[PDB]
Amino acid sequence: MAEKQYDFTHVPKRQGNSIKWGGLKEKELPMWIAEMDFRIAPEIMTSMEEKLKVAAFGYESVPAEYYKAVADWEEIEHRARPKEDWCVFASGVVPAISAMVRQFTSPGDQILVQEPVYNMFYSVIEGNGRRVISSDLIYENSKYSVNWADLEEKLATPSVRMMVFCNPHNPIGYAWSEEEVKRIAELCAKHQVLLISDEIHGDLVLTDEDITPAFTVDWDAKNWVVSLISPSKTFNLAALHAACAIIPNPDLRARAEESFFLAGIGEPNLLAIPAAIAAYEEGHNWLRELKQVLRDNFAYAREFLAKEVPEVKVLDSNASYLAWVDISALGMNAEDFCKYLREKTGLIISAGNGYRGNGHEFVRINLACPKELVIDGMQRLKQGVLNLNN
Amino acid sequence: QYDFTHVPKRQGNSIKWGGLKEKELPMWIAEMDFRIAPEIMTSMEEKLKVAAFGYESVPAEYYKAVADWEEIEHRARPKEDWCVFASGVVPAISAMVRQFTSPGDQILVQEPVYNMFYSVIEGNGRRVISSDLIYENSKYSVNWADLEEKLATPSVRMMVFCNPHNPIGYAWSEEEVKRIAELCAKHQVLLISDEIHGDLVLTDEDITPAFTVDWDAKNWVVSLISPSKTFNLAALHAACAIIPNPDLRARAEESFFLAGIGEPNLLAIPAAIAAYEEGHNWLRELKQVLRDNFAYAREFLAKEVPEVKVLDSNASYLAWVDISALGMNAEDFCKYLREKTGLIISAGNGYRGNGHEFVRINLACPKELVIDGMQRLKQGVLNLNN
Lengths: 390, 386
Ligand SMILES: Cc1ncc(COP(=O)(O)O)c(C=O)c1O
Ligand SMILES: Cc1ncc(COP(=O)(O)O)c(C=O)c1O
Ligand SMILES: C=CC[S@@](=O)C[C@H](N)C(=O)O
Prior knowledge:
2 copies of one chain form a homodimer. Chain A contains 12 helices and 15 strands. Chain A has 390 residues and is an alpha/beta fold. Chain A folds into 2 domains: 29-40 and 284-389, Aspartate Aminotransferase, domain 1 (Alpha-Beta Complex); 45-282, Type I PLP-dependent aspartate aminotransferase-like (Major domain) (Aspartate Aminotransferase, domain 2, 3-Layer(aba) Sandwich). In chain A, strands 2-10-9-8-7-3-4 form a 7-stranded mixed β-sheet, with helices on both faces. A 4-stranded antiparallel β-sheet of chain A has the order 11-12-15-14. The first copy, chain A, has a two-stranded parallel sheet with strand order 1-13. In chain A, α1 (42-52) runs antiparallel to α9 (272-282), α2 packs parallel to α9 and α3 (93-104) crosses α8 (250-263). Chain A is globular. The two termini of chain A are 41 Å apart. Chains A and B meet through α1, α3, α4, α8 and α9 of A and α1, α3, α4, α8 and α9 of B.
């Protein structure tokens, strides 16, 4: 090849309290939870080791440099520069959603999602005492589509007060077109519904199709949107706890910031600021190479399952390092299949059940690991399927 | 064995030191101007070498380190099962305010007390009620009749207890903590005992954690701890709730997850474990520097600014200074001090109670900074008399 500047071959050796790699049995292969088995960009590491040299970790403000980095990143990577004053630090995307659920809806209000969607959406809606309402994505011809009439009918319902929009959508791995994003933002604005656009997979569109950040919608609807971003999925920094809400409406923004502070997610920890700035200032080259690795892993995985496991169907996706795999032909509830698969092969993938929708027919597989592990997992999956047919 | 002489060089986004004018001396916000313990630094450096920061569990090595630390430092040992990770003490209070009380309910504090108690009570739409600490003869005391009368009020549903008490720097006696816990249990009031200053008792005394009170009251208590104040790790975001009642504990744990404060960041677990397993020697050295600084502060002011009084305190690195004899509202005295001398201390007003007669001074800094701050304090008063 042309030499890659960075290391996508060696799996980082985690400490014992890793969710992905802790308490596994011998030879078990975790490909479920969405973190990478790649080392992070050395540019980010350098900024973290630099910060540690302070050797005292008192209270931190959010510097202008943080929002500048966020804005520069969105401009360069997605050709949509937010205003830096739109940006508000939050310690995490899901905690920010949870705080905005409490701040911008009332107990008993309904909050719209499009099932199947990220399981943590349900937890922060239901656990906060709001009610999930879904305009289900319709599954036909191996693709999901939106029932736009049903979506609007639910948005227009008085008790439906917020839409948590997954953009790109996890677990189906779909980066919405500009038209779809602006249509949903316009729908929300029309019906006075707050659009929370979870854009945490936005840097991981594995094609050149870009995302459309919600904050780029025109100024009728722009006052009704919040874009949520983080370096965590892009750069393998789940535990960094750095995120950013982009809220063009200044009063909404100040209220969300107040809700972040009140909840305890408004203040950066000791690494969040320098590590996120380094990621958004200097992570471009590493991300470029990562997407080349991911496209290689996906090309292999999709080709393998096409030729070798016709019992399953990998859905066409263009975003995320996660594959959404239809296992319906196995006649087995995804939760039962994933248990069986783990017991027989050691491969641990995500049952689709927790994403609701039709997720009980699907598994989600994380391909953000060295190709050796992709090959291992794909072969284990075939071994699991073959063991059923016998 | 450790460096308590040289102030760490912060990056620019520091709350205590960022954006100061030339030669300004901040002694207000409670973070130290000391290097952290090298044993903690070692664990952070090695964790960064993982070079990938995915999701982390709370290992029960964390709970074991917490239990061991409480036993060594306070002679009190919680059951590991009682322990729930939280990223911060104040956010845990805020979550428990939302989980365990209703909007409009009253939540009892003992003024003057930590300003952030008011922020999380009132910010969540609960109402602060205070049984004010009685201030007589330079000492604060509890009006036990008043306290119980308010705790017995039906709409008073929670007590946020500062143990040791910031800003006065008082580690309650065993009898005091038990009596408060008994009163809370008697009136079905949840006792949230903020013990974040619990490792900073400077006398030969020990705090009494709320979780040590006996089972006729232990079901009504929550102890909150963190290495933050002890080890100068405000930005680590590691803390722990100790909740003996398992029903409360399950509900508190869920409220932390929903708030976004239930999950450790990439350094919280190894750094806190290192602090609790290996920080005893550094803390022992810290306390002697703190006692030396308090002694200097008390002696200097007794000789030089006799119209002010450093309260006898047994806990924390925060001096609570009665300035009432200056005849000046504390907030105006602090603004005047900053403008005239560059010394930035904490006005007492924000702690409510009788806080307008007090300032709070952070002595967790090298002796040379204390000497400077005291000198500026005297100079400000001298200039007022001129
Ligand atoms: C759609 C979506 N939102 C949010 C998150 C995580 O957000 P955070 O950990 O910053 O709260 C993930 C995880 O990768 C995700 O897939
Ligand atoms: C009484 C008290 N509680 C809590 C805190 C800080 O809590 P948190 O861990 O939320 O920053 C402080 C600050 O040092 C404090 O003095
Ligand atoms: C004005 C001072 C802000 S502050 O120090 C809150 C603090 N951490 C404490 O211990 O009270």
